[PDB]
Design a protein around this ligand. Structure first.
Ligand SMILES: N#Cc1cc(F)cc(Oc2ccc(S(=O)(=O)C(F)F)c3c2CC(F)(F)[C@H]3O)c1
Lengths: 104, 110
């Protein structure tokens, strides 16, 4: 559970701005190679419109649970995940994602 | 029969900054579903790195044509084979950052 859970942070455009190193033991990516890239680059084609929809809920509500989606792994194949996302607004400044890996 | 095709403009990073409305019939998205997003987000995982290196190269090619073939995810979530021919433009009265003009055609891979 805990060793399958990692955080990421995203700009409002969905780009990674930070990722736990734990994503390396789970999906193969190095956090540094993620930064600057949209989450979009990584979803399975069959999940993409759904994530766009969860995204819209996140922006209108401020927090949301993604429900189940696939991330293309660093060395081929897809890993299932469920994410809770939370918008950090200040005085939108970023999105915090708590990401739980459902599958190997 | 006309090939189906639309023009787009991107910044050097790949982000769509202009989309010709012929895109609806070509890939099924409205212009605004494309504007502001990187073209690499609509690209097949096996073709993403080619497309990123294509954008990197078109800017070193002195405004000449670079062409690339890749699979683009239509609004039906089908993979369409795309040929994108691109070249840079930079107004020589200025020293503004060049941008990238693309023409995007649905082609047969065969
Ligand atoms: N594939 C993948 C992947 C793997 C991750 F560890 C995080 C991620 O990004 C999100 C994964 C889930 C969500 S979400 O739960 O907030 C909504 F999009 F589903 C969101 C994002 C980016 C966001 F902009 F913050 C937000 O849209 C995508």
């Amino acid at each position: 559970l805990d060793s399958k859970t990692f955080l990421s942070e995203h700009s409002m455009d969905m780009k990674f701005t930070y990722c736990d190193d734990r994503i390396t033991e789970l999906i193969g990516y190095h956090p540094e190679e993620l930064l600057g890239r949209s989450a979009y680059e990584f979803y399975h084609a069959l999940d993409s419109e759904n994530m766009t929809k969860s995204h819209q809920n996140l922006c209108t509500k401020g927090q949301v649970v993604s429900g189940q989606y696939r991330m293309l792994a660093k060395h081929g194949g897809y890993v299932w995940l469920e994410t809770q996302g939370t918008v950090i607004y200040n005085p939108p400044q970023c999105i915090m994602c708590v990401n739980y890996v459902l599958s190997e | 029969c006309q090939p189906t095709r639309f023009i787009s403009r991107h910044n050097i990073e790949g982000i769509f900054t202009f989309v010709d409305h012929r895109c609806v019939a070509t890939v099924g998205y409205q212009p605004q579903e494309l504007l502001g997003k990187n073209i690499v987000e609509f690209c097949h995982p096996e073709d993403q790195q080619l497309l990123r290196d294509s954008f990197q190269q078109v800017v070193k090619l002195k405004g000449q044509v670079l062409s690339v073939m890749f699979r683009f995810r239509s609004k039906n979530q089908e993979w369409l084979w795309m040929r994108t021919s691109s070249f840079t433009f930079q107004n020589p009265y200025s020293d503004e950052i060049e941008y990238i003009i693309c023409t995007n055609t649905n082609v047969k891979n065969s």
